[PDB]
């Protein structure tokens, strides 16, 4: 028997588009629509670890300050700045949170229903941005957590129209 | 001088799913290791075998009650991973995001009844052969079938075997083909004593030889 | 053809130990609980032992309860019977058997062996 | 799945009338299986699933008075033939039948398809074909009419998917 | 003798144009013109197994869903989709279909003149789609055919008029 | 630093038979081997020398009667892939899509005749050569001709020999060009014994060393 087409590795390894997209964005991969494929695999784990990668498409020049960093920092130059071309900019980013792995829910606060804020990526700056794409490199996944499929209302089961070659 | 190259026409573009990498940006960063952690799963069928989950009787319970009525068919239920008794299952779950399947899946069957009631019951798998599920307890002997009784554990499993014409099944049952689509199971009660409100509990899982084919997403988004 | 294979058997004195041995061929030996019959002389066979294949079990009769060992192969495809503390009722023929059905019946199963005989000394 | 191996036996039967006012291009088909009364058409009814091949002997009664030549052939995937591919029947598995020369013919297929099982009460591969090439020339000397045969039995029947009875 | 040109290998290795063109596709390999070469050295075998690619000029993004998938998911981004360039799309795409070799003559029907709707290679979806051609790669045959050549009405043969340098 | 290079001019477009292959979009897909397939066909050219096809006689049959008339000459037909007689042959199916070729073609004859009835042929073949065939059935044994009598075999083969200028020959013989355009067969009748509707029934294949070169696709499309 062959299961490759089910690796965690393998699954999570595609461009998924991120919906909320502000001219100032804090890239957190809990942003992800909960029902695609990535989001609903992804809330399927407690916790996770993974690199990144995404596709912006920007007017102007593009900064990146890392977790930690002041919201005051995206103004300068210093930072990594990525000067734009045509179609959109391509780049890689690495994971510098301070945990050792991140966490999809949390039991409580962390300040002496909402993860704490330093579960992220990052952050990008443009004088606007108008898509933006993430995708995780090397995932890996712990714990895992109930994984729910569409409900059935009265029939026996799901009807979903197939492709057909019919003419 | 220098190398002579042709810039190729239809190539370039950027596909969702291409397997190149992009040019890094902040170099020289160590992270701290992950290593020794409890609980990693690398592989999401291996987590579906080794944990089974309960099904959803009629009604939103999870096992099924003994009948006093003639009809001494317990229940049937469809074998098909978008059938409604399947609808609150991991497999089914996983089985929501591709295409195509093959291979065995396991029946568990728990017995909660009180320990002063016996019984004996079978089951018995109908592929998608005669129009008519056998409803009778003793026609479905043609079937391929067991028996099992609660007097030397508890706790019987079953297995489900693959029959089909190609060699791989659609899992997405299709609005078209009506028709008892490939599977059914139902249970007979040869004998109860005592047993009016006495429980029985059955959960599914993925068989030893399971697979999913073709990763897609077809939920509405 | 899910074909059965016994061997083991022999004669032994009381409270010894035997082990008897199941060689099973064919494409269903994962799926089909396997178990043991004994069929004394002038008798019926009986349910002696049965051993499950998913989690691995076990269910012993109550005659011999507390003194036998069923236990399984399934990358050999063999299934063996560790017998102890001996006693003259045990001497008969055993059957090993299979099918999807866990029953103490044993028309019920399909699939049966040849046999091997059992002898105990007192 | 199991062999079966009653179910592989000779059944004798008839194809057609060959007398002397047909030219060539005369076309009589019998698709396989056809309506076997022994253990066969209770597999094809009780079972689902079946897979085997063919063989058949056709025989034509007369003598070496009669002047003519009849073609016999297996085609898989059977259709309709228009005039013009009549001329290329030798393509699939055939024998010649002639008085003159031969009088039994002999073909041996085996499984083959899309799916690894097929549902017979559904879709039919194999086809016997018999074709007048020249045309029964006769004379006072020589038989007004002859009668062919076919015997024809499964070869490796092989059933998967056992299905219970109708009573 | 050299007998390298009538390979069957290489002489299905050339993009061919598929006429019927829509918003939404189901790619078939039996929509292609049945009297051009590919076409027609097609027909001629009944059995058929091959990869494919395919080039598209298309407005907007382009979408593949694999065979089995249902007919909403063409409007989900999650699925492989390819981002406009100028000229056209190249892409390859595998064999998804369940069934181990396709056909091009079906003899019956397989729901409980027209090849089930399984005998395809997926589908694809954009705003629109003005050309699209297809090349079968490492193509194999079964079962050769009748092939007919063009009728002669009444000239003992075809004349067809060759290139020729005349001035 | 970073390579340069130069962009040519010219090179890079789309050409409908270049040997360039396509970035993937999808991988890891494993499809159930077809192996042990009978019935598996590599060459056109092995399919047409295997299994001969008829030859389409006048008013659309596929065998000469023998005829009780003066004329000897039972008939004849154009050698040729773009013939009136090979017009329904599998042969020339496959040869319509090429322009040149070079080879033997073979003949078949076989006797559907009455046991009782005997009878005497030859064939002849003619070259482009003399303005006329040589209809006259002693005139054609100064050509590479052949004699089979129907009393040791009812089937008798005869081999078309290949003789042109050049090395390879058009297939698609052309609108200019008339007169006999390479070669005809003419099949004579010695004698006959109550051989009034006594059949002959002529098939053509490839032969040995036959050989097609260019593809072209020449219909209306």
């Known amino acids: 028997q062959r299961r490759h087409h089910t690796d965690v590795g393998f699954i999570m390894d595609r461009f998924v588009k991120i919906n909320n997209t502000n001219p100032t964005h804090v890239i957190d991969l809990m942003q992800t629509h909960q029902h695609g494929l990535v989001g609903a695999l992804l809330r399927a784990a407690t916790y996770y670890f993974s690199d990144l990668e995404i596709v912006v498409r920007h007017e102007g020049n593009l900064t990146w300050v890392p977790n930690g960093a002041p919201e005051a920092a995206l103004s300068n130059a210093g930072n990594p700045t990525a000067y734009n071309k045509a179609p959109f900019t391509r780049l890689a980013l690495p994971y510098t949170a301070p945990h050792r792995v991140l966490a999809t829910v949390y039991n409580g606060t962390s300040k002496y229903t909402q993860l704490p804020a330093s579960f992220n990526f990052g952050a990008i700056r443009a004088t606007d941005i108008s898509e933006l794409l993430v995708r995780m490199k090397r995932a890996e996944l712990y714990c895992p957590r109930p994984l729910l499929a569409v409900e059935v209302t009265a029939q026996d089961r799901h009807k979903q129209k197939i492709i057909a070659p019919a003419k | 001088g220098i190398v002579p190259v042709a810039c190729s026409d239809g190539y370039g573009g950027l596909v969702t799913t291409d397997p190149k990498t992009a040019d890094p940006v902040y170099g020289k960063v160590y992270n701290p290791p992950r290593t020794n952690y409890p609980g990693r799963f690398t592989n999401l069928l291996d987590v579906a075998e080794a944990c089974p989950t309960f099904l959803c009787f009629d009604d939103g319970k999870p096992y099924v009650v003994t009948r006093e009525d003639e009809q001494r068919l317990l229940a049937k239920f469809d074998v098909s991973l978008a059938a409604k008794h399947m609808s609150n299952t991991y497999l089914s779950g996983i089985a929501q995001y591709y295409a195509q399947y093959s291979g065995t899946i396991n029946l568990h069957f728990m017995f909660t009844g009180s320990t002063d009631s016996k019984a004996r019951y079978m089951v018995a798998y109908v592929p998608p052969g005669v129009e008519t599920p056998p409803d009778t307890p003793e026609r479905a002997a043609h079937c391929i079938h067991a028996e099992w009784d609660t007097g030397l554990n508890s706790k019987f499993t079953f297995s489900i075997p693959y029959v089909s014409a190609a060699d791989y099944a659609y899992t997405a049952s299709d609005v078209a083909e009506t028709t008892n689509v490939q599977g059914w199971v139902c249970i007979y009660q040869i004998t109860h004593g005592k047993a009016q409100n006495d429980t029985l509990v059955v959960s599914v899982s993925a068989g030893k030889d399971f697979e999913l084919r073709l990763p897609i997403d077809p939920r509405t988004q | 053809q899910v074909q059965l294979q016994q061997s083991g058997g022999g004669l032994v004195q009381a409270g010894g130990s035997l082990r008897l041995s199941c060689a099973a061929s064919g494409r269903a030996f994962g799926y089909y609980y396997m178990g043991w019959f004994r069929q004394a002389p002038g008798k019926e066979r009986e349910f002696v032992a049965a051993i499950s294949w998913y989690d691995g079990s076990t269910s012993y009769a109550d005659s011999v309860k507390g003194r036998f060992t069923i236990s399984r192969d399934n990358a050999k495809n063999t299934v063996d019977l560790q017998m102890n503390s001996l006693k003259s009722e045990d001497t008969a023929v055993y059957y090993c058997?299979?099918?999807?059905?866990?029953?103490?019946?044993?028309?019920?199963?399909?699939?049966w062996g040849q046999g091997t005989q059992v002898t105990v000394s007192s | 799945e199991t062999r079966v191996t009653q179910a592989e036996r000779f059944f004798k039967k008839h194809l057609f009338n060959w007398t002397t006012d047909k030219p060539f291009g005369h076309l009589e088909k019998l698709k396989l299986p056809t309506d076997h009364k022994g253990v066969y058409g209770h597999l094809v009814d009780s079972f689902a699933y079946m897979r085997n091949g063919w063989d058949v002997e056709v025989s034509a009664v007369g003598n070496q008075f009669n002047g003519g030549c009849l073609l016999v052939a297996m085609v898989p995937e059977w259709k309709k033939f228009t005039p013009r591919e009549k001329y290329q029947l030798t393509l699939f598995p055939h024998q010649f039948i002639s008085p003159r020369t031969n009088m039994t013919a002999h073909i041996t297929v085996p499984y083959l398809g899309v799916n690894r099982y097929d549902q017979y009460k559904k879709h039919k591969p194999w086809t016997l074909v018999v074709m007048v090439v020249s045309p029964l020339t006769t004379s006072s000397i020589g038989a007004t009419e002859i009668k062919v045969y076919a015997n024809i039995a499964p070869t490796h029947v092989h059933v998967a998917g056992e299905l219970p009875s109708k009573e | 003798q050299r007998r390298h040109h009538t390979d069957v290998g290489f002489i299905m290795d050339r993009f061919v144009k598929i006429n019927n063109t829509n918003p939404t596709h189901v790619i078939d390999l039996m929509q292609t013109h049945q009297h051009g070469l590919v076409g027609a050295l097609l027909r001629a075998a009944t059995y058929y197994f091959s990869d494919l690619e395919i080039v598209v000029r298309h407005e907007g993004n382009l979408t593949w869903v694999p065979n089995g998938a249902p007919e909403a998911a063409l409007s989900n981004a999650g699925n492989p989709t390819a981002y406009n360039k100028a000229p056209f799309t190249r892409l390859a795409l595998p064999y998804t279909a369940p069934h181990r070799v396709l056909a091009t003559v079906y003899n019956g029907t397989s729901k409980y003149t027209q090849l089930p709707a399984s005998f395809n290679f997926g589908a694809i979806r954009a705003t629109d789609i003005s050309e699209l051609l297809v090349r079968m790669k490492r193509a194999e045959l079964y079962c050769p055919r009748p092939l007919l050549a063009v009728e002669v009405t009444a000239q003992d043969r075809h004349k067809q008029k060759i290139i020729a340098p005349a001035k | 630093g970073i390579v340069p290079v130069a962009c040519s001019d010219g090179y890079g477009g789309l050409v409908t038979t270049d040997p360039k292959t396509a970035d993937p979009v999808y991988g890891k897909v494993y499809n159930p081997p077809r192996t042990n397939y009978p019935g598996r066909f590599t060459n056109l050219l092995d399919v047409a020398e295997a299994c001969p096809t008829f030859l389409c006689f006048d008013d659309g049959k596929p065998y000469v009667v023998t005829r009780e008339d003066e004329q000897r000459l039972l008939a004849k037909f154009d050698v040729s892939l773009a013939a009136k007689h090979m017009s329904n042959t599998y042969l020339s199916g496959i040869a319509q899509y090429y322009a040149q070729y070079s080879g033997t073609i073979n003949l078949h004859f076989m006797f559907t005749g009455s046991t009782d009835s005997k009878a005497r042929y030859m064939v002849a073949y003619v070259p482009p050569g003399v303005e006329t065939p040589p209809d006259t059935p002693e005139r054609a044994a100064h050509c590479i001709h052949a004699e089979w009598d129907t009393g040791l075999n009812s089937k008798f083969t005869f081999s078309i020999p290949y003789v042109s200028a050049a090395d390879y020959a058009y297939t698609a013989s052309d609108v200019a060009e008339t007169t006999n355009v390479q070669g005809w067969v003419c099949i004579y009748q010695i004698t006959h014994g109550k051989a009034q509707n006594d059949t002959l029934v002529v098939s053509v294949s490839a032969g040995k060393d036959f050989e097609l070169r260019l593809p072209i696709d020449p219909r209306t499309q």
């Open positions: 058997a299979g099918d999807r059905s866990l029953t103490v019946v044993a028309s019920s199963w399909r699939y």
